Design a binder for this molecule. Sequence first.
Ligand SMILES: Nc1ncnc2c1ncn2[C@@H]1O[C@H](COP(=O)(O)OP(=O)(O)O)[C@@H](O)[C@H]1O
Ligand SMILES: Nc1ncnc2c1ncn2[C@@H]1O[C@H](COP(=O)(O)OP(=O)(O)O)[C@@H](O)[C@H]1O
Ligand SMILES: [Mg+2]
Ligand SMILES: [Mg+2]
Lengths: 417, 100, 100, 259, 259
Amino acid sequence: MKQGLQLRLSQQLAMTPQLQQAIRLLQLSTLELQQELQQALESNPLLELPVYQGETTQTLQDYLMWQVELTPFTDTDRAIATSIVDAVDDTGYLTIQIEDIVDSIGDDEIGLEEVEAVLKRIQRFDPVGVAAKDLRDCLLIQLSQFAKETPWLEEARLIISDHLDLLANHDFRTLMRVTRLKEEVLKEAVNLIQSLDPRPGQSIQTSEPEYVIPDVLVRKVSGRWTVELNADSIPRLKINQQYAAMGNSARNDADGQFIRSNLQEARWLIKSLESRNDTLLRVSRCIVEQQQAFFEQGEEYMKPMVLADIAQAVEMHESTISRVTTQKYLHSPRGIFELKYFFSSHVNTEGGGEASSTAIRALVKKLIAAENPAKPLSDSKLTSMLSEQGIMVARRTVAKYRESLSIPPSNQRKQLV
Amino acid sequence: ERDGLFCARIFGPVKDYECLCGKYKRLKHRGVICEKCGVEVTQTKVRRERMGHIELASPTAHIWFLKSLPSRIGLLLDMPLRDIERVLYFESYVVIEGGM
Amino acid sequence: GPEEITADIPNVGEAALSKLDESGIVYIGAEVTGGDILVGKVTPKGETQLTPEEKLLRAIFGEKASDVKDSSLRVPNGVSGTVIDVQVFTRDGVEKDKRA
Amino acid sequence: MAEYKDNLLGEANSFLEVLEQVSHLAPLDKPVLIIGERGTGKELIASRLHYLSSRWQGPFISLNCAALNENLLDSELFGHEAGAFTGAQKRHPGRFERADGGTLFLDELATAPMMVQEKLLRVIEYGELERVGGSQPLQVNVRLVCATNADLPAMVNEGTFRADLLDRLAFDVVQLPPLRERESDIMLMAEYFAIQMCREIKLPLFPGFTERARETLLNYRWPGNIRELKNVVERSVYRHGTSDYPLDDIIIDPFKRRP
Amino acid sequence: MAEYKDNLLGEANSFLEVLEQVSHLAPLDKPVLIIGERGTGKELIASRLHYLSSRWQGPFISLNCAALNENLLDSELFGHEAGAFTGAQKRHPGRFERADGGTLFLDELATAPMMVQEKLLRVIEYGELERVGGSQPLQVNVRLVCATNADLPAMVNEGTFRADLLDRLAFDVVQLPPLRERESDIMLMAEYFAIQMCREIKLPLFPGFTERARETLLNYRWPGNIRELKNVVERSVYRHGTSDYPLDDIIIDPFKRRP
DNA sequence: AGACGGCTGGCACGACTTTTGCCAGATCAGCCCTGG
DNA sequence: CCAGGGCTGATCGTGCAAAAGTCGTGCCAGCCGTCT
Ligand SMILES: Nc1ncnc2c1ncn2[C@@H]1O[C@H](COP(=O)(O)OP(=O)(O)O)[C@@H](O)[C@H]1O
Ligand SMILES: Nc1ncnc2c1ncn2[C@@H]1O[C@H](COP(=O)(O)OP(=O)(O)O)[C@@H](O)[C@H]1O
Ligand SMILES: [Mg+2]
Ligand SMILES: [Mg+2]
């Protein structure tokens, strides 16, 4: 039972460089594909009233500059105000700090007190609490703005002054014993703080556009939806008849060989592109077949799958399917997702079955959301009722799902009723 | 896009002082050009004042001349517009020189 | 993400949302003038950054996270009237149907 | 650095002298060799020698020359690179390279065949080794510790051992006194093992020792110095099984019939 | 190549002759055989012999004739090409190919297997070598240096050594004298070694020897030329442990009865 | 006020997935040259 | 003038495997709630 150089065949393989190019041709999205396809089209010669003058809109910075133009500053104050308002984000909080602004001005005469005077002058502009250094001096401006007649104002000012972490950690008991403040009569003061419009500069303009492009289409024909490719998005190449009908006529060997080689390259490229489209269509049809339940019933009713499960259903390889299913967005009546989004890790449940990770994550989302606000549900209890459902995932996986879901811990979301 | 229509490094910067890459984004930089992307840090109103050019490797005629009521090329060469037009589209093969 | 009509509109007063139902659309018979809100629609924004500022804002206030922007349907300026009836259309496969 | 005393019992007379001698060997970086009868607790001192060293944090690995697969001997001794021969899917660390800054335990040098002697003859003096199917050589620094059972000078004259390797590993030799000659700590070793065994059988307490048992202890030749004394104490105390009285009889051989 | 000092403390007439002969043979290209007794600085000579030549800048690689495997013997000697067998995945250089321009220093040639003996002769004579699965002949030039302690004229008569392999390798053999022939220089060696050893063990300064210790170290057989004097002096000074009075205790053999 | 229990997160360890990086050759058919 | 040989180019081919990466689940440390 030895070390010896031995040899026995059971496999086969072969490949050429242009075949490598053709097999990497299907790894990339269509919009990025069209660039390289246009590049090859440029090289190969035998291959191949409207609304205008929109309106100008008023953003936050333009509005603030407009208001600066009608306020009585000096020239130096105007330059400082222009710099300050230039250093303003969409949310309404200035990005760079005051000493950075002073350095940007770069004047010996200019001082921190002068810059503070100008900034506080422009703090009272139409979006209240705009151009604030951080959250601490944005809520305070509006609290000071509100008339003294409304109650709990002093309480709200005391909390917002130097108890910001005390409120952020939702540690109401320590907040009480720190402030010496009233029991459950602080709730309306906290609510007053809540109703204070954080991020005030956002509301100057809120238009967001629609940017969706579908690669694969699925439609419900009264059960067992059939999948079609995007006719407009798909690329296509057509041979050129003029140049295909002049390779034989040419009597020069150079021209003849040139046309022959370019014909060969163009036909190979067309064949490779058609094969890529066919492979993508077949893969999409098979994955939609194996995911018919989820489209009907929702994310939490998703069967876990691996690339092996979808590769065995076809004659392609796991690597081939992995290359095809990158940067492909399929459109469904429920919405737009990615082909790579369907594949997920599996966890074993009670009764021998397995549940998909994304399904359990969505179930955790809805279960956590539908909870009493006074008593939060922790990760251990989440594991407990998941085991009652029969899923029995570990508390570590529960915590990982909750963290990836961006929900803060249970002790962090506790709040007064 | 990079080196195309509606591009940066030509036609000026984009909506604000920030460069395309993301670095060098403030009024503190007033005329500098980033290294990862060549974008002058100036106002975006300059985007309507900066023009580019196309090399056009092969020469090309100008249709405003040689196709107005008089033809400027025709009057310069004493050559009629019909032959000018036939030569300007690769079916006439005019002679340049040759005295021998 | 999909846009939703949930009447959870940020940067707005309680007086503006007085005429809106739970789903976010006006009651039948309400009188509306000028620039009041008819349908409360929100458009999702990018994912909240890990930055401590946004983390603090979420911990303090919550439920906004700058996830949504106020792109609601408002009555055009100088238009006043009383709402006769509304009509809502939902595509197949979508079963939101808040009050549809 | 800590004490690393581990298990130390029955220390008196020449055994204490041996411990005193070996106490200062650890700082040195010269090969050491231990001579002793089979089962004379030689490994205990060899292990403690590594811990008493300044670089006690070095990993400790042990090989027994009596157990070397002749087919895999070279690969185990040096180390094999990836793809050097068929079936080598990944690069595998060799035993010599496995310990760097840590000692290597060698055993049964008296049973080392000429083949292993020649293969290992050079890696010691210069600390230089090249892996089988290797392109470039590696250099390491390891303190070798060896244990044996026979008369290496006698095997040298007999011709089955190489004097070159012997003097390569003959800086100093530690002679462990056999317990049947010391005769000064037999009571202490026996009683210690008795307490351990009676404790682990969850019995209340251990009774004394019978005078007749002491009488018959010294008479026995004791081929097993401290490897069969522990065993006989354990088996005899198990046989008794009670704290009733000091055990009169010691079951020196288990093969003896019950009647 | 201009300046090379390291070790070589011994200074006698017998050593002078061989060290001067090495200087003559160093520029020459022909291979040399280094015969001698165990532990006589054979590596020190071979190393200096190569590095004093005109090809010092070339690579210097050594190997043990016994260490390398018998199964992968040919691959170790020559190397293999990618795809020759299942395991192989890239072209692999052999020792003869890595040692181009430089030297190949075989160690303990007397223990080389019959397989190596019948493998090496044809390539060593002329310079032709075929890589495993190769397509065309390869030609490299390697100055050969070999050293062993055995008696080749007697070995060839026994028949475990190839006659022609010895014949095409034994041009101008080099013989070193045993330690007993140096006479006076052993005191210089002992003084040097003791100084280094006491430096290592942190004692301040050597106190010197005595006339008794001098006579004892002078008059003894010295079966091992060197690496035995080093060991004996370093063990004696270690057992001394202090420099209040001169070094007098001499311990030629660690193998002794318990004190 | 201190200890006990509990909650959460970083790090580690098998077990399993998925991602990229490989780089021709032989074999067959029609045309041209040449023998019968 | 018809049949045999040579020669050149046209044609075929989307998988294997190795290593990086990801997964689930445990172990341990540090902060917090609560009763004594
Ligand atoms: N000083 C000691 N006191 C008590 N027991 C010892 C002492 N030294 C060694 N032993 C015991 O001797 C037993 C065998 O040790 P050893 O002979 O080194 O094993 P090996 O057969 O591997 O050489 C160990 O189980 C150990 O408990
Ligand atoms: N002339 C010398 N000066 C100093 N040290 C020497 C001399 N000759 C031999 N040695 C010592 O001998 C050792 C080399 O042993 P060596 O004789 O090469 O072993 P082998 O005989 O197995 O080749 C070195 O550690 C070196 O310190
Ligand atoms: Mg043992
Ligand atoms: Mg040697």
